Amino acid sequence: FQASMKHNINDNTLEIVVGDITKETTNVIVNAANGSLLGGGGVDGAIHHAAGPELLKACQEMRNNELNGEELPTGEVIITSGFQLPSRFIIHTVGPIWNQTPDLQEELLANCYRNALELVKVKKLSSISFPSISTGVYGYPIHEAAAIALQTIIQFLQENDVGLVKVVLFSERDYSIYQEKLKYLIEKI
Ligand SMILES: [Cl-]
């Protein structure tokens, strides 16, 4: 069993679900990466394993070329192919590390979502899946991160035509928090 809920915001749809993000057939899936775009554990690890080795080579080519060796800055995004993933593209983003930059970190986390959704708009794609950014080894508390993710996504969908946005969570616990936070946020609209 895998729980799910949805809500329509104008002609967009927001869905939260339990599942494996690497099995999503949306146009885009989002990877919670590190600035170096090197393979790690967690969701990033699952994404590299499902994508195949062409994903790491593609990411390192982009780092050495369009980024000129620089780290992907916190909140910013890049896009690659999906390779062996069932999506067309992967948008890589870097979430804030909890309490590294206290008065900026809420804004930075929000930037991940905003910059990803803006890229979907530009490329004229119509479906995107997000995992829970920064709530792995980066330690952002899930209750706070969930509120920022949902507030930012709902805000964007209220103001733009995108299509379908999914938040795909491997954890039933993370799901349970998102469900109550989304329900809360919906009541306030
Ligand atoms: Cl700061």
β-strands 164-169, 12-18 pairing: parallel
User: Which SS3 state, helix, strand or coil, does residue 55 take?
Assistant: helix
Resolution of the PDB structure in angstroms:
1.9
Q: What whole-number distance in Å separates Cα of residue 156 and Cα of residue 14? A: 11
Token code pair at residue 87: 């999506």
Give domain 1-189's CATH architecture: 3-Layer(aba) Sandwich (3.40)
Token code pair at residue 78: 């890049």
Residue 34 CA neighbour count, 13 Å, CB half = 14
User: Which SS3 state, helix, strand or coil, does residue 90 take?
Assistant: strand
* 44 tagged catalytic: yes
Token code pair at residue 42: 């967690």
Ligand 1 centre to CA of 97 (Å) is: 12
Q: What whole-number distance in Å separates Cα of residue 89 and Cα of residue 81? A: 4
* Structural contact between residues 108 and 75, judged by C-beta atoms closer than 8 angstroms: yes
DSSP-assigned letters across all residues of 131-166: --TT-STT---HHHHHHHHHHHHHHHHHHS---EEE
Q: Ion ligand 1 — residues with CB under 5 Å? A: 101, 103
Q: Is 137 annotated as a binding residue?
A: yes
Q: Is 170 annotated as a binding residue?
A: yes
Q: Which residue has the tokens 């967690």?
A: 42
Backbone angles phi, psi at 64, to 5 degrees: -75, -20
Ligand 1 centre to CA of 102 (Å) is: 5
In sequence order, the β-bridge partners of residue 16 are: 5, 167
Experiment used for this model: X-ray
Q: Which residue has the tokens 């979502």?
A: 113
Q: What whole-number distance in Å separates Cα of residue 140 and Cα of residue 105? A: 9
